[PDB]
Assembly symmetry: none
Homo-oligomer: 139 residues x 10
């Protein structure tokens, strides 16, 4: 069952990003805090939509896609990925990682249903690395 | 039984509207949050009275009336409305939607008594759409230039904001943002984008490239 | 005092409308005299650009909300 | 048997390119007209030598080579090309397409002898696409303003020309033209469009409305 | 002469309309040609502020009286 | 039998309108005075032709037509109008009110013959209201 | 069988429109000349694309649509239109007039196949009236 | 004379390239010396804005067509 | 002191590079920290024309010699 | 046995480079003179360290590396290089050309011991071409 993040925590994090900036160690610590439980693509996408401005959000979408593509290359380079399965029918496509696959587009409940925990942690680590890249790039 | 919304949440939402404005995505998210349970006309009316100023409140009353009238036209166009009933005696008049009907004027308890859940959700959706209209109305992309002293991320933020919060179709925002990056964004960055050995086909890619190769100053 | 409210040279129109409606509704006027006063104050205050914008209205505006909507539509973006 | 194109038609086409330019729709129509029958490499080469200046001719040679190389890649990707044959001995090399193969260099009769009709039509389509590329390259919408003394039909002509002859998708031209009519087109016409009792949702409708209610001066 | 009548830079509109209607009705035109001439003289004379005011009329004005009423309503008070 | 209004009274009223204007209470009182007996369309038309300038006269013709049209709408909304009759053959057309009907065009005697007293008082009240509108509009 | 108009005549007409303008009587005579035989929607559309600038072409598309809509209203007001038939299965839709119907989009040969001569003359008269409107409007 | 050709202050670049290629190919140079001369004349003529535009080319341009394409891409729209 | 070295407004780039490399190699830095410091001093000193020239390098320059070669190739002849 | 170049000749060559520059034909002739006998990597490296400034020395190191890499590509393209041998055990690596191989780093005697005469002449020609490139580049 999907539970959304508190809008109070999200508002506090947005104001933190607004006053301290993207690169302060306190901001990265707060992001790591709100990046503790494995989030669904819907959660991370809306979180970055709210805390980041328009141009940093575009940059972050780009960087997140690139990092997820690196993850999928490593996944096709190793059939023992915690997102993959043993047979070929469990291979994870980027539509399933970005939340674009069938039964997931716009629906967080179905998303949480079909996604694997390894998928969730890989998406989360990818999003964190992308946030780091964009923060280092913006300023 | 009617339970009022917390004045603490209402005060926080009012201050959010006061600092961030009516159109910020955080404000719309907060309104969607306080618009979660189906509200009675009394609740939404007092909520908009408190969070909105006088002139936006007048505009919102107008827009809410218009949207409720569209709803009632659709209701008389379909006898299977969740606010309607099967017989003609359950047809829902605008006095019952705006809370003006008999046994409802000024009394939220009686309101909650006589109203249907379909009535409540229709009123709530109408009020949300009216709030969106008024927010879009209360507060030009083709006039945006990068100032001589302005940084590029500020210019990109301002431009993307003005382009996405405008009347363009959703499928026309990215090409417009790109072509505005290319023609605005004073000639140093113009030449920096022009002499791109790779083809940049996304605002994010253009922003990344410019941030990499920009003249540190 | 409502009759002393003017739209400043740099003030936007929604702020002026908010201030004016506040001062008119929080005053000693009868309830049935607020809308005509708000309209006639929109027409005579609200510095001559908006005055001419309201004057040359092909439609007849008979409500403060309608005047506000019209002015917000056709206002000089600046 | 090879028959040359009339020098009268070629002279008329050259003067058309000289007065109207490379990108006018009348010029492209005339080129399509003289590109009706499948031409031999000699014909197209001499035609572009005559109608184009030196620098556009260099650009066109480059673009024609690139397009022919794409064609030959598609040909090696499909043995059923109308220029190819079934066996490997009919595979078509770029020397045969550009007219550089044995028995063809400088001789149009031998050229017409050895060439295939599929070869001819592929060469012709390649040359047409290369001409389009060079024409788009040889000669900004977001910088167009209506001058203080300029009429509105001239401004609309210039703006529609620059918007349709640009890199925008076809589905993004009308909204951009409308929003440029609204934000450019100096504040008298801006206010004239703003105070439109009807909603104008097409550049033609906006042009008609403005032409009706414009300030005669 | 009616075709030489212009609205002066400082003249009001009712004086200009009076002068023009006087000169048009007291002339050699047929009776069935006075109203169209008066209208088309209101549109082309009557210095460009009122010209643009008549041009941007959301309704179609088909009578000198209607044009006079419209202009008197929406005129720039000065 | 039709009796014309005195040109002396009309000249005095015209000079009153010329010096005091259209909107002064003395002018409206004088108009009410000369609007005492029910006038035929000929009388009111010539009166407004003489006392009003050309442009106010055009405005007044417009306003008089509009008010007479409102009167005729009320008349078709009530068959008991003092201008109407009981049967449908007495319904009053605008040609009969404006003096344009058959046997009335340009002839005040025939006008006075065919017109009803209710017709006369309705025409008179309409003309007075139109004069008020034009006076409020001119200045 | 469809035969295109000569590009020489079209070039001469375009230069006539360029030097004399849209409203000169010589230009209207030349347009009437090139509007002699009933043209297919493809022909008139390309002709106006070539001879008219971008903004006059937009205006002309609007006016042509309006005039064709008036024609279709008259057609549904009279089942004896030379474009219509006797039964309801021959009723002519605007997709068939503007060349947007099935089997006609972009293909002039199929266009000439399915279209009626009454359809062609109605389209032609509509286009001529639209050209007149736009010419009167542009200058 | 090819060695006397300069790009005028108001002249576009395609006109200058046309004139230069015409004068170089219609001259007494050997056929194998036209391309290097055209390139080195693009670099030293073609007033200093385009000179600096060609100088700061991240890629090496080794053909008049490539230089023309690059300059047409990155030229200062004016 | 290496951290106080700036390229003068009139100084050429090879003189500035010579002075900077001299002061960096004849200082108290470890041997493994000279190349990164020389690069980052080329990027932040070396007045903004050369700063932008190095910034907009389509290739990644990872050595002082490569930076010097690139700048000498694409420098503004003056 | 390794014999160093005279510091008197090196001082004269350094002053020649200082007064005449890098590109003068007299300077290139002097370099060709001091480039007569096949030099060990130590000799050429110290020579360029002394006669060239810091920035030209960096440029020259770059160019020398590139030219030596071209030489090693030609060497792997032909097993009959005077630096190579017949078997695969005599293939010459860039560590042996730049003097970085085992038993050579910093020791000119061991360098002269293990190096081949073909190796020496290839290194020398590479260094001369690199000097020419840097001289053409510096001014």
């Amino acid at each position: 069952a999907w539970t959304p993040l508190e809008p109070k925590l999200i508002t506090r994090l947005a104001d933190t990003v607004r006053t301290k900036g993207l690169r302060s160690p306190i901001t990265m610590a707060e992001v790591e805090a709100l990046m503790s439980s494995p989030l669904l693509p819907h959660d991370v996408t809306n979180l970055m939509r709210v805390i980041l401005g328009p141009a940093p959000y575009a940059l972050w979408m780009d960087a997140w896609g690139v990092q997820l593509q690196t993850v999928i290359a490593a996944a096709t380079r190793d059939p023992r990925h915690p997102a993959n399965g043993q047979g070929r029918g469990e291979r994870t496509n980027l539509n399933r990682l970005k939340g674009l696959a069938d039964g997931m587009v716009g629906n967080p409940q179905g998303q949480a249903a079909l996604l694997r925990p390894g998928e969730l942690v890989a998406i989360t680590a990818s999003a964190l690395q992308a946030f780091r890249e964009v923060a280092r790039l913006a300023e």
